[PDB]
C-alpha cells in the first residue's frame, strides 16, 4: 500500500534512507538514485543534496 522514493512506487529491492530526518520522502529505491550497493557514511537524497 505505502509508496516511496521520487517515483512514488511501492517498496522493492534494497531501499536507502535519506539522512535528513526532515526528508519528506526518506526512502528511495537503490535504482532510482543510481546505487547498486549500500554506501558507507551518511547519504542524502538528490533534492536534499541539492540536485
Amino acid at each position: 500500500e505505502p509508496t516511496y522514493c521520487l517515483c512514488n512506487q511501492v517498496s522493492y529491492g534494497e531501499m536507502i534512507g535519506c539522512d535528513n530526518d526532515e526528508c519528506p520522502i526518506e526512502w528511495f529505491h537503490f535504482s532510482c538514485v543510481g546505487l547498486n550497493h549500500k554506501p558507507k557514511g551518511k547519504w542524502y537524497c538528490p533534492k536534499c543534496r541539492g540536485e
Binding site: 522493492y12 534494497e14 531501499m15 534512507g17 549500500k38 551518511k42
Partner: peptide, 8 residues
C-alpha cells in the same frame, strides 16, 4: 548509510 530490504 541506512538501508533496508523489502519484506512481504
Amino acid at each position: 548509510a541506512r538501508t533496508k530490504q523489502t519484506a512481504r
